[PDB]
Structure formats: structure tokens, C-alpha cells
Amino acid sequence: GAMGSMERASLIQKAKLAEQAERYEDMAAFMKGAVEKGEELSCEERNLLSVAYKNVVGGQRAAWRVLSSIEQKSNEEGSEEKGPEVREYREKVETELQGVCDTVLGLLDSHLIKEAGDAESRVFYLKMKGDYYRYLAEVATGDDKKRIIDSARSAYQEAMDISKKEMPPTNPIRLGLALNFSVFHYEIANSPEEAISLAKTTFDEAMADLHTLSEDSYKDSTLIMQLLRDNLTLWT
């Protein structure tokens, strides 16, 4: 890797600089470099890694959705034939997106997950694994679609089982996981009832645990709770 010759601490420092400059591709490349040094990531470093790739693939997904919409319209009755260009460019963006998901999944498999023993790290990495299989599933149309969807579900489920045993209901990682798995159910698995049930139960169990928190922990937990409420309002 092109980051092989750079110090781990230098990579983390530059990832933070790239974040400030809103240079997410750079951020991601720095954090990939840091992961590949082979040491475990701290809490802060895990967050830098997730922020970087979330931003890169988030951009790609938005672009893919624009291009897909254009492509769908082109395949409607009455639409004039414009050639292969829209499909080719959607495919180009898709392939790049898949490439980034494969990279992230690569990092988690080699070897972030197998070394993650604490609940906060293992739940976090398994949530990411769920997420990047979910993005792959968004663009999947072939023989492997079902297996991709199940790979997402399996990762999310393992994260869920750990989170319920080892973390309080207000833990931001536990909350974030539940939020995303609930979206997985709604948007990928065609299970809107499961999506709603999950969001609701997660919200309610968190509400009942807020009394145990400091002001700052309260702020963190309630932020994510409002996102669960936002999704419930969208769906009901």
C-alpha cells in the first residue's frame, strides 16, 4: 500500500486533517493505511475509520441513485433511445461503489473483527460489516443478491446479540446499530413491520434507561433516539 512507509500516528494525524478539509477520500486512504499497520484501533480511531468510509460511500450512493433514476426513466414507455451511455456510467459508479465496500469489508475481515474482544469494538465492526453488505445489496440484481442480503442480516444479528447482552439500552453504539438494522429491515429485507417493531422497542428501552445517565451521555443517547423517532414518523 502507498501508506506502508508512513507512521501510524502520522496517518491518524492526517486523517484528522483530511476530515477538517472535508477530503474524505484522503481520510479513508489514511485510515486504511492505519488499519493495515496491524494494531487494534482505539475508540477514536474506529470512529475516524467509519466517518471516512461513510462519507465516501454516501457520496457514491447519492450519485448511483441519480443515475439509476435517469436510467429507469429511459426505460419507460415513450422515452427516446439515447444509447448505452446512461447504463455504462451508472455501471461505472456502481463498480467504484462496490470497490469501496469490498475494501471496507476486507479491512474488517483482515483482521479487525477477529481481534475485537470488547463489546464496543466488536459491535461497532459487526455493524460496519452489516452496513457495507447493505450498500452492496442496494445495487445487487444478480444470483448473489440473496446471499449479500443474508451476509448483512448475519452481521447485524451477531452485533445485536452482543449489544443486548453486554451494553446498556442507551449505549450510542447499541442505538446506532438498532437504527441501521431497522433500516435494513425496511429498505432491503422487505420487512417494514420488523423495522418498525425494532425502532419502537429500541426507543422505549432507551427512554427507560436515560435516568442513569449524565448530562453529556443523555445528549448523545437522545440524539440517536430522535433519529429512531424520525424513521418511525416516516414509516407510520
Binding site: 437504527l179 433500516v183 425496511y186 429498505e187 440517536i224 424520525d230 414509516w235
Partner: peptide, 5 residues
Amino acid sequence: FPATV
């Protein structure tokens, strides 16, 4: 689209 983090 729905909220994710």
C-alpha cells in the same frame, strides 16, 4: 431516505 449513522 431514512436516517442511518
